[PDB]
From Swiss-Prot:
Changing residue 231 to T: Abolishes the catalytic activity. The lineage of its organism: Eukaryota, Fungi, Dikarya, Ascomycota, Pezizomycotina. Pathway: Antibiotic biosynthesis; penicillin G biosynthesis; penicillin G from L-alpha-aminoadipate and L-cysteine and L-valine: step 2/3. Its cofactor is Fe(2+). GO terms for biological process: penicillin biosynthetic process. It catalyses: N-[(5S)-5-amino-5-carboxypentanoyl]-L-cysteinyl-D-valine + O2 = isopenicillin N + 2 H2O. Belongs to the iron/ascorbate-dependent oxidoreductase family. It comes from Emericella nidulans (strain FGSC A4 / ATCC 38163 / CBS 112.46 / NRRL 194 / M139). This is Isopenicillin N synthase. The record marks 211 as: Transition state stabilizer. 2-oxoglutarate binds at residue 279. The gene is ipnA. It is an enzyme of class 1 (oxidoreductase). GO terms for cellular component: cytosol.
Length: 331
């Protein structure tokens, strides 16, 4: 009949990953392994982050920022004066054509003092921020959130490492405040009446979409969304609906994880169904350092041997973000 099934997205209590009960951490790791080998998604619960404040502060920002402020913060794709802003800054909507808009920021430790900024290494940028007096407390909240979700992500990486049979720091040792290329994106999906057809895509299977299929450019992705169902994950039997949960974090592996595990943990393909509803999508992309290299392995093989070439994370990220724009469009 062409009906759509619902993806199995287990809720995993990740709180043992913050503690020192090693057996309890292994039991979390088993659940991460099972989810990563199934649909590729799970909900992290008991994460310790105040996601209500995150949603409230984000909404206040989205709903009070003016067109003048958006131009002032706009990335190079919308403002030719800002050639240094390839990643960080505001991503404008286009009424009548493009509904989505967002604000992306990077490691707050990227300053003019940082040697990667001094060296002008690709993918490193100094964050841009609105005026404090026009957006009181926003930058402080946003930077605090970066480190809040950094801490959650570090614990999740311990779970992934144990799940793959490694020591718990196998990934986290490359995830550091002084060089991480991780990013936060505060995405607004608006309610619009009428909703512009030009902002709606039609999938091959006929589904109306706001964003087409993609793998995440990340090691893992740590995503908060408001309570409006929209995501679908691709399975061999077709796309399946991911149910919403505005109290937890949706977790999945990115294509760097698929590379280094020889696809043992696949990077799930997801897409965004079109829904005419005001809502939030707030991903944290767990990226490593520019020179981070994890030696690939294959958990399926007794000797764990993989002849996949080691891939520097900075090259992976630069190529990945460009390719995602080319394939799915400038967001
Ligand atoms: C939940 C996702 C599907 C979310 N989309 C996303 O996260 C989108 C599209 S895959 N992600 C990106 O474009 C990559 C952003 C990378 C960021 N600017 C950076 O420099 O690090 C959505 O809600 O659209």
């Amino acid at each position: 009949m062409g009906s759509v099934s619902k993806a199995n997205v287990p809720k995993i209590d990740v709180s043992p990953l913050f503690g020192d009960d090693q057996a309890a951490k292994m039991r979390v790791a088993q659940q991460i392994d099972a989810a990563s080998r199934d649909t590729g998604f799970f909900y992290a619960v008991n994460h310790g982050i105040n996601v209500q404040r995150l949603s409230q502060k984000t909404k206040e920002f989205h709903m009070s920022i003016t067109p003048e402020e958006k131009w002032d913060l706009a990335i190079r794709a919308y403002n030719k004066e800002h050639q240094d802003q390839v990643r960080a800054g505001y991503y404008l909507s286009i009424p009548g054509k493009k509904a989505v808009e967002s604000f992306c920021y990077l490691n707050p430790n990227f300053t003019p003092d940082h040697p990667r900024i001094q060296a002008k290494t690709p993918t490193h940028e100094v964050n841009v921020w609105p005026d404090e007096t026009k957006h009181p407390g926003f930058q402080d909240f946003a930077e605090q959130y970066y480190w809040d979700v950094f801490g959650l992500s570090s614990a999740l990486l311990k779970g992934y490492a144990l799940a793959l049979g490694k020591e718990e720091n196998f990934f986290a040792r490359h995830f550091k405040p002084d060089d991480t290329l991780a990013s936060v994106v505060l995405i607004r999906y608006p309610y619009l009446d009428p909703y512009p057809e030009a902002a709606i895509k039609t999938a091959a299977d006929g589904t109306k979409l706001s964003f087409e299929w993609h793998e995440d450019v990340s090691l893992i992705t740590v995503l908060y969304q408001s309570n409006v169902q929209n995501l679908q994950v691709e399975t061999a039997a077709g796309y399946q609906d991911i149910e919403a949960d505005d109290t937890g974090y949706l977790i999945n592996c990115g294509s760097y994880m698929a590379h280094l595990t020889n696809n043992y943990y696949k990077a799930p393909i997801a897409r965004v169904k079109w829904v005419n509803a005001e809502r939030q999508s707030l991903p944290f992309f767990v990226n490593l350092g520019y020179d981070s290299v994890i030696d690939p392995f294959d958990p399926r093989e007794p000797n764990g041997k993989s002849d996949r070439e080691p891939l520097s994370y900075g090259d992976y990220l630069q190529n990945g973000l460009v390719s995602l724009i080319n394939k799915n469009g400038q967001t």
